[PDB]
Design a protein around this nucleic acid. Structure first.
Ligand SMILES: Nc1ncnc2c1ncn2[C@@H]1O[C@H](COP(=O)(O)CP(=O)(O)OP(=O)(O)O)[C@@H](O)[C@H]1O
Lengths: 1119, 95
DNA sequence: ACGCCAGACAGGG
RNA sequence: GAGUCUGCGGCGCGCG
DNA sequence: CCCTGTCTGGCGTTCGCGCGCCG
C-alpha cells in the first residue's frame, strides 16, 4: 500500500513529548537523579530548605539550629510488577542528612532518618499507588500579582486587588467610597489604605501630591488625619485592628510575614511575579515580594503602585487597565510536581510543628534522632494526597491514546482552595489564549464540563505554568524557521498571522493577509506581520488531531469524535484507519504501546515472550513482552512481535506492536467498506447495521481479562479454610477445581462454576435445632461448615488463565488483618462483535448494531464484493459533519487503488484532487471489467436512466463515460442482494474507518427478580451477583399516577420494594400461583415515622373517628 | 392492540372503572376455581404449545373476553358485599 | 457561586 | 424443614 | 410611632447507570 500526504505547510518543529509535562515536572520536582551539587534546587530540595533551618530561640532554653545537608533517595523497596501483583505502593525511600546545633559545645549529626516513602513515576508518565496505575492531572488558577478590576454592583469606579499565594498570607483590596470613607481589606474589615502607607513611611502630604497630582481620589486617603499624624504608632494601631486580643508590643514580628519570607512567594526572584508587575502595574520590586527586615523599617514598592493604578484605572487612559482573566497570560497551570511539593511542604510544617514541642521535651543534648523527628505526619500527608486527593483517578487506557489524553486534560477543580464547582461561567468558557495551550473540544460533555480540557498539540509548559504556544518569527516580509514559545501575555503585544498565508519561502505572498492582534481578527499588511502561527495542529489537542477532515465537521460533533477515541477497545486484529491525520505513529510511540529498537542491529531470538536483539555495538538485549496483562480497565495488553529471526533493524523500529497497533500505527477499530444508504429499519436515525462477514474474519473482536479475588478470613467461629471440599452436593462441579482448592489453569469456567473453594462456619454463635434433626436423619456426621465458595457471578466467565495464592508464610506481601490467605483467579474470554455493541467513526456518527445480516443478501457491488456496513443517510443532514462523507469518497479510491493517504487538518486533500484519484480508481474498477470480458448490465443501464433523469450524469454520453462521471461523484451502482435488482439511483460507498467502543458493565444488562435489601432503608439493592433493582423516580410515579394505574403504583411502593411482610408473602403467593395478599405498611413509612419520632415530633396514624390505628403491628406497645 | 378495547371502553361509564371490573373478575376467576366462566364450549380462550389455554394461562385475558360478551354484570352495588363470596364457594368446585 | 423568597431592623417624616 | 452476612459517605471519570 | 427601603438570612440547583478507590 502507498501513502500520499496532501497539505503542505512546513511543519517547523516536532510535537513535544506528549508526556513531557508529567515527566519533566516530576524530574525537576525531585532532582534526586543528580547529586545535591547540581544547581536545580526547586521542588523537594526547595521545600526542604524552606522549612529546614528551624530557629527556636528563647522560652526557657533554646538556640536550636537544625540544618539540611543533602537529600538522597535511591533504593526502591520492591519493583513495579511486584507492586501490582501484591497490593503495593511503588515508592522510593528518602533520607537526607541532618545535624542539630547547640548553644553549648556540641553538634550531633544523625545522618539518616527514613521519613516518608514518596511514589515514583513510570517511564511512560503514570504511577502505581496501590495495585492500580494512577495519574496526576494538572490544574489552573489565577497566578500571584496585583490587578484592578471594575466595581461589583455600582457602575461608578473600580477597586484594586493584591494577590499573595500561599493561602496563608493576606488578600488586599483598595476601594474608595468618598462620603467619608476609604477601604483597604486584609482579611475582611476595612481600615484605611493609608493607615498602612503611613506605617511604611508614606505621609499624607507627599503621598497625595505625587499619586494624586493627576487624580482626585487622593481626598479619601488624607481623610482620617487623626491616625495619620503618628508613624510607628500606626504599626501598633493596625495590630490592634486585627482581632484576638494580642500584646500591643511586637517590634516587627507580624510585619515580617507580609513582608519577606513565607506568605508572599519564593517564586524565583525576577520573572515569577515581577513579570506581572513591570508590564501590568508599578515599576520595581525590592526583594522577591514586598520584602525587608534590615532596619525594622519596611519598604513596599508594591502597596502604593496597586492603588496608583486604581487611581489610574478609575480616572483615564494611562493605558486601558481591564484585565481579561482568561487571557492565559494570567491564569496559571499547576503541574504534578507543584501539587506534590505543596503537600510535601504541608507535611513538613506538620512535622516541624511536633518537633518544636520536643525541643523542650528532650532532657539534655542527646535529642537529634528520635527526639526531633516523627515520620507520622509526613507519611499520612503525602499518602493522603496520592490516595484520597479528589484529583487522582483510573488511567483511561482504552488505547494508549486514551491515557495520554487523560494525562494532559486541564482542570480547575482541585485542592478545593482554588476553584469550587457551582462557581465559574467565566472560567468554563474557552478563553482566547487557550490557543495551543488547552483543547477547546477535549472538554467532556456532562455536568463536569469546561473545567476539564486536554492541552493542544505543540503546547508545552515552559518554566512556570504558562502554556506557551509555538509561534515563528517573521522579520519584515520574511518568515523564519525559528520559533518562540510565547507567554500568553507577550502574545498580545504582537501582530501574529495564520499559517494559511501564501508563502514562497521567507516571503509573504499577499498584501492583504490575515493576522490577529489581540483576540481580534485583523487584516494586516505583510510589513506589519511580526509573527506567524506554527501550524494548524497546535490549535487543537492530540486526541483531536486524530480526526481526518476535522475542517468539515461541526466543532460540537467533533468533540464526540475525540471522546469516542478515548473509549476505543483493543481489537485482536488492529487496523490503522484507511485515512489518517498524521499523529497515529506519534501516539503509539510517545505513548509506550509498541517496543522500539534502541540501536541498529540484527535479531537473534523471536519468541512469543521475548525478542533478543543483537546490536552492532557487540551487545545483545533480551526484550520481554508483556504477554497478557490486566489493564486497570480490564483490557488486554500484549506486545505482538512483528520482526522475524535474524533481521537488521533500523534505530527506532517497531520490534513488537503495542496493545492496539497494526504496524507502528495507532489502531482502534478497522477500515471497512461501507454503503451509505437506508435499509428497512435496521439502521435507524442513530442506529446502524453490520455484515456477518465481518465476524467471519475476526474483524471486530477484542480481549477482556478479569481479576476475581477471594480471601480466607479468620472468624472467631473458626478459620475459613481453602480446600477442594465443597460440603454439600457434587463432584461434577469439582473437576475444574483440580489442584486442592485452586482451579486448574486453562479451564473453561462458565457462569456459576467454582473458581475457588472456601469453608466458613454456619451460624453467628449457635448451631441450629431444626437443622440438627435434618443432619441426623440422613447422616448426623455432616461437616457443620457452610458452603461459602467464590462462584462465577451471573453474567459470564471464560477460561482460567492465571491463579495466585498467598498462604501462611508470606514472602514479602501485605496480608490484611483477619485475612488468613487470599486467592486471585484471572479469567479471560473472547468477545465477538454483536448486536448490543456500539461503534463510531472519528467524525461523530455514533451508533449501535441493530442487525447482523448474512452476506447472502446485503447490498453487493456489480462485482461480487459485498458491503460491510450500511450507514443511515438521515443521520448526517441535521448533524453537520460532511467530513465523513469525504472520508468515504477518498476511501473508495484507496480500495481499488490499493493505497492509504494522509489528509492534514485544514491543509489536506481537496475535492478536485479526490475526484482525480477516483478517476484512477475507475480504471482499476471498470478497466479490469472491460478486459475480463464483460460490459454493462440491464441493471447498470436502468439505474443510469433514472440517474440522468435525476441530474447526476450529462444526458447523451456513453454508459462507459457516464458511469465514470457517476463514480467521480463518489457513488456506484449496487444491487439489492436480496432480489438481485439494483438500487434505483447511485449510492456512494467507500472505505470508512470505524471503531468499537468500550463495553462497560453498563452494557452487560441487569434483570432482578428477588435479592438483597438495604440495612437501614428496606429498599432492594444488589452489587456482586444480585443485579439490584431499578429506580422508579417521582417522574415515573407521576406517569402511573396519570394513568389509573392504582395498584400498579401501590405494588411499586409496597410489594416490590419496601413492604417487608408484603414482599415475603408476595413471593410465596406467586410460588403457589395464588393471588398476592393485601399490602402491609411500607418499612419506609415506618422508618420515617420513627426518624420523625427521633425528633420531638410525634406522628400518629388515626381511625375513622380521630382515634389510633397501628402501623407498627405490635412492637410499639411496651414490654 | 387488545381485543375490542374500544367496545369495552364504551361498555363502561369511566375508563378506570373497566379496569377495576376486569381485574376483580380475573381475581374471582382464579380464587373460587378457574372454571368460574360463562362461555367455555365452542370458541373460547386458547394457547398453542398444545391447546392448553383452556385451563389456566392468563386470568384477565378471559375476564375481558367475557365482559366483551353481554353475560356479566358490573355495578356499584349489585349484590351485598359478604353474601356473594358465600354463594360463590357453594356453587363453584375446583379449590 | 447565583437566584429567589421572606424578613427583620433602621432611617426620614 | 436452608438463610446469614456483606456492599456506607464522599470523591474522580464515562453514557444518553 | 408609621411606611419605605436595604441589607440580611435561609434553600435549591435533572435523572438513572458503570467502574474504581478509600477509612
Ligand atoms: N445533561 C443531560 N441531562 C439529561 N439528559 C441528557 C443530557 N444530555 C443528554 N441527555 C438526554 O439524552 C438524549 C441525548 O440527546 P439526543 O439523542 O441528541 C436527543 P435529540 O433531541 O433527539 O437530538 P437529535 O435529534 O440530534 O437526535 C436527550 O434526549 C436527553 O434526553
Amino acid at each position: 500500500m502507498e501513502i500520499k500526504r496532501f497539505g503542505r505547510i512546513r511543519e517547523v518543529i516536532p510535537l513535544p513529548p506528549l508526556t513531557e509535562i508529567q515527566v519533566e515536572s516530576y524530574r525537576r520536582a525531585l532532582q534526586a537523579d543528580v547529586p545535591p551539587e547540581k544547581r536545580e534546587n526547586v521542588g523537594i530540595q526547595a521545600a526542604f530548605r524552606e522549612t529546614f533551618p528551624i530557629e527556636e530561640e528563647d522560652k526557657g532554653k533554646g538556640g536550636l539550629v537544625l540544618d539540611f545537608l543533602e537529600y538522597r533517595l535511591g533504593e526502591p523497596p520492591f519493583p513495579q510488577d511486584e507492586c501490582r501483583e501484591k497490593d503495593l505502593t511503588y515508592q522510593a525511600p528518602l533520607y537526607a542528612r541532618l545535624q542539630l546545633i547547640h548553644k553549648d559545645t556540641g553538634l550531633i549529626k544523625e545522618d539518616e532518618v527514613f521519613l516518608g516513602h514518596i511514589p515514583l513515576m513510570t517511564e511512560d508518565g503514570s504511577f502505581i499507588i496501590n495495585g492500580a496505575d494512577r495519574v496526576i492531572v494538572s490544574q489552573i488558577h489565577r497566578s500571584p500579582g496585583v490587578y484592578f478590576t471594575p466595581d461589583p454592583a455600582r457602575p461608578g469606579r473600580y477597586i484594586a486587588s493584591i494577590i499573595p499565594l500561599p493561602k496563608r498570607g493576606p488578600w488586599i483590596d483598595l476601594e474608595v467610597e468618598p462620603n467619608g470613607v476609604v477601604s483597604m481589606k486584609v482579611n475582611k474589615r476595612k481600615f484605611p489604605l493609608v493607615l498602612l502607607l503611613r506605617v511604611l513611611g508614606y505621609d499624607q502630604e507627599t503621598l497625595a501630591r505625587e499619586l494624586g497630582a493627576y487624580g482626585e481620589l487622593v481626598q479619601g486617603l488624607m481623610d482620617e488625619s487623626v491616625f495619620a499624624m503618628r508613624p510607628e504608632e500606626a504599626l501598633i494601631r493596625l495590630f490592634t485592628l486585627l482581632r484576638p486580643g494580642d500584646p500591643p508590643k511586637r517590634d516587627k514580628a507580624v510585619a515580617y510575614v507580609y513582608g519577606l519570607i513565607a506568605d508572599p512567594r519564593r517564586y524565583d526572584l525576577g520573572e515569577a511575579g515581577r513579570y506581572k508587575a513591570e508590564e501590568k502595574l508599578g515599576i520595581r520590586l525590592s526583594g522577591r515580594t514586598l520584602a525587608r527586615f534590615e532596619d525594622g523599617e519596611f519598604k513596599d514598592e508594591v502597596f502604593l503602585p496597586t492603588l496608583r493604578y486604581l487611581f489610574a484605572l478609575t480616572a483615564g487612559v494611562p493605558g486601558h487597565e481591564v484585565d481579561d482573566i482568561d487571557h492565559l497570560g494570567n491564569r496559571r497551570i499547576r503541574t504534578v510536581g507543584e501539587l506534590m511539593t505543596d503537600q510535601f511542604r504541608v507535611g513538613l510544617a506538620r512535622l516541624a510543628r511536633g518537633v518544636r514541642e520536643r525541643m523542650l521535651m528532650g532532657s539534655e543534648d542527646s535529642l537529634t534522632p528520635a527526639k526531633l523527628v516523627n515520620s507520622r505526619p509526613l507519611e499520612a500527608a503525602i499518602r493522603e494526597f496520592f490516595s484520597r486527593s479528589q484529583l487522582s483517578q483510573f488511567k483511561d487506557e482504552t488505547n494508549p491514546l486514551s491515557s495520554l489524553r487523560h494525562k494532559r486534560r486541564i482542570s480547575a477543580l482541585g485542592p478545593g482552595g482554588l476553584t469550587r464547582e457551582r462557581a465559574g461561567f467565566d472560567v468554563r468558557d474557552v478563553h482566547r489564549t487557550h490557543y495551543g495551550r488547552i483543547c477547546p473540544v477535549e472538554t467532556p460533555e456532562g455536568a463536569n464540563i469546561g473545567l476539564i480540557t486536554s492541552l493542544a498539540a505543540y503546547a508545552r509548559v515552559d518554566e512556570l505554568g504558562f502554556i506557551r504556544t509555538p509561534y515563528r518569527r517573521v522579520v519584515g516580509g520574511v518568515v523564519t524557521d525559528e520559533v518562540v514559545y510565547m507567554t500568553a501575555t507577550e502574545e498580545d503585544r504582537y501582530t501574529i498571522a495564520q499559517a494559511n498565508t501564501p508563502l514562497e519561502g521567507n516571503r509573504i505572498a499577499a498584501e492583504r493577509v490575515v493576522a490577529r492582534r489581540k483576540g481580534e481578527p485583523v487584516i494586516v499588511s505583510p510589513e506589519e506581520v511580526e509573527f506567524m502561527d506554527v501550524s494548524p495542529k497546535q490549535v487543537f489537542s492530540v486526541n483531536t488531531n486524530l480526526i481526518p477532515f476535522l475542517e468539515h465537521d461541526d466543532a460540537n460533533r467533533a468533540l464526540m469524535g475525540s471522546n469516542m477515541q478515548t473509549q476505543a477497545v483493543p481489537l485482536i486484529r488492529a487496523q490503522a484507519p484507511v485515512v489518517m491525520t498524521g499523529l497515529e505513529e506519534r501516539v503509539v510511540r510517545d505513548s509506550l504501546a509498541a517496543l522500539y529498537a534502541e540501536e541498529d542491529g540484527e535479531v537473534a531470538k523471536v519468541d512469543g515472550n521475548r525478542i533478543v536483539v543483537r546490536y552492532e555495538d557487540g551487545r545483545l538485549v533480551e526484550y520481554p513482552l508483556r504477554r497478557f496483562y490486566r489493564s486497570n480497565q480490564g483490557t488486554a495488553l500484549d506486545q505482538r512481535p512483528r520482526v522475524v529471526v535474524g533481521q537488521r533493524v533500523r534505530k527506532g523500529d517497531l520490534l513488537a506492536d503495542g496493545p492496539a497497533s497494526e504496524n507502528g500505527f495507532l489502531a482502534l477499530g478497522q477500515n471497512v467498506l461501507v454503503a451509505i444508504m437506508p435499509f428497512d429499519g435496521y439502521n435507524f436515525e442513530d442506529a446502524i447495521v453490520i455484515s456477518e462477514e465481518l465476524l467471519k474474519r475476526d474483524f471486530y473482536t477484542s480481549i477482556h481479562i478479569e481479576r476475581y479475588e477471594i480471601e480466607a478470613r479468620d472468624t472467631k467461629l473458626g478459620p475459613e479454610r481453602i480446600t477442594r471440599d465443597i460440603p454439600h452436593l457434587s463432584e461434577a462441579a469439582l473437576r475444574d477445581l483440580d489442584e486442592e482448592g485452586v482451579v486448574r489453569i486453562g479451564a473453561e469456567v462458565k457462569p456459576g462454576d467454582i473458581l475457588v473453594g472456601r469453608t466458613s462456619f454456619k451460624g453467628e454463635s449457635e448451631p441450629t435445632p431444626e437443622e440438627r434433626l435434618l443432619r441426623s436423619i440422613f447422616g448426623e456426621k455432616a461437616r457443620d461448615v457452610k458452603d461459602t465458595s467464590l462462584r462465577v457471578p451471573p453474567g459470564e466467565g471464560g477460561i482460567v488463565v492465571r491463579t495466585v495464592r498467598l498462604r501462611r508464610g508470606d514472602p514479602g506481601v501485605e496480608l490484611k488483618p483477619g485475612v488468613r490467605e487470599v486467592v486471585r483467579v484471572y479469567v479471560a474470554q473472547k468477545r465477538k462483535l454483536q448486536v448490543g455493541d456500539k461503534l463510531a467513526n472519528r467524525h461523530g456518527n455514533k451508533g449501535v448494531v441493530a442487525k447482523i445480516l448474512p452476506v447472502e443478501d446485503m447490498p453487493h457491488l456489480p462485482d461480487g464484493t459485498p458491503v460491510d456496513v450500511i450507514l443511515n443517510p438521515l443521520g448526517v443532514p441535521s448533524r453537520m459533519n460532511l467530513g465523513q462523507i469525504l472520508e468515504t469518497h477518498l476511501g473508495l479510491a484507496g480500495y481499488f487503488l490499493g493505497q492509504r493517504y494522509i489528509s492534514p487538518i485544514f491543509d489536506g486533500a481537496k475535492e478536485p484532487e479526490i475526484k482525480e484519484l477516483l478517476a484512477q480508481a475507475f480504471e482499476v474498477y471498470f478497466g479490469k471489467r472491460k478486459g475480463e470480458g464483460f460490459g454493462v448490465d440491464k441493471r447498470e443501464v436502468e439505474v443510469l436512466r433514472r440517474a440522468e433523469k435525476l441530474g447526476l450524469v450529462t444526458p447523451g454520453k456513453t454508459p462507459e463515460e457516464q458511469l465514470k462521471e457517476l463514480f467521480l461523484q463518489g457513488k456506484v451502482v449496487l444491487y439489492d442482494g436480496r432480489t438481485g435488482e439494483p438500487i434505483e439511483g447511485p449510492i456512494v460507498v467507500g472505505q470508512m474507518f470505524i471503531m468499537k467502543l468500550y463495553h462497560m458493565v453498563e452494557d452487560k444488562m441487569h434483570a432482578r427478580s428477588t435479592g438483597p435489601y438495604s440495612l437501614i432503608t428496606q429498599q432492594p439493592l444488589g452489587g456482586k451477583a444480585q443485579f439490584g433493582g431499578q429506580r422508579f423516580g417521582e417522574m415515573e410515579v407521576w406517569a402511573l399516577e396519570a394513568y389509573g394505574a392504582a395498584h400498579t403504583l401501590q405494588e411499586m411502593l409496597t410489594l416490590k420494594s419496601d413492604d417487608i411482610e408484603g414482599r415475603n408473602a408476595a413471593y410465596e403467593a406467586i410460588i403457589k400461583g395464588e393471588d398476592v395478599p393485601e399490602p402491609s405498611v411500607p418499612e419506609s413509612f415506618r422508618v420515617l415515622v420513627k426518624e420523625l419520632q427521633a425528633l420531638a415530633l410525634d406522628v400518629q396514624t388515626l381511625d375513622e373517628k380521630d382515634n389510633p390505628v397501628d402501623i407498627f403491628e405490635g412492637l410499639a406497645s411496651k414490654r | 392492540a387488545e381485543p375490542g378495547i374500544d367496545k369495552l371502553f364504551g361498555m363502561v361509564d369511566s375508563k378506570y372503572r373497566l379496569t377495576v371490573v376486569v381485574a376483580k373478575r380475573a381475581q374471582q376467576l382464579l380464587r373460587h376455581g378457574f372454571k368460574n366462566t360463562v362461555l367455555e364450549p365452542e370458541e373460547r380462550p386458547k394457547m398453542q404449545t398444545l391447546e392448553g389455554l383452556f385451563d389456566d394461562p392468563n386470568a384477565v385475558t378471559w375476564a375481558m373476553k367475557e365482559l366483551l360478551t353481554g353475560r356479566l354484570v358490573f355495578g356499584e352495588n349489585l349484590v351485598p358485599e359478604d353474601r356473594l363470596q358465600k354463594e360463590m364457594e357453594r356453587l363453584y368446585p375446583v379449590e
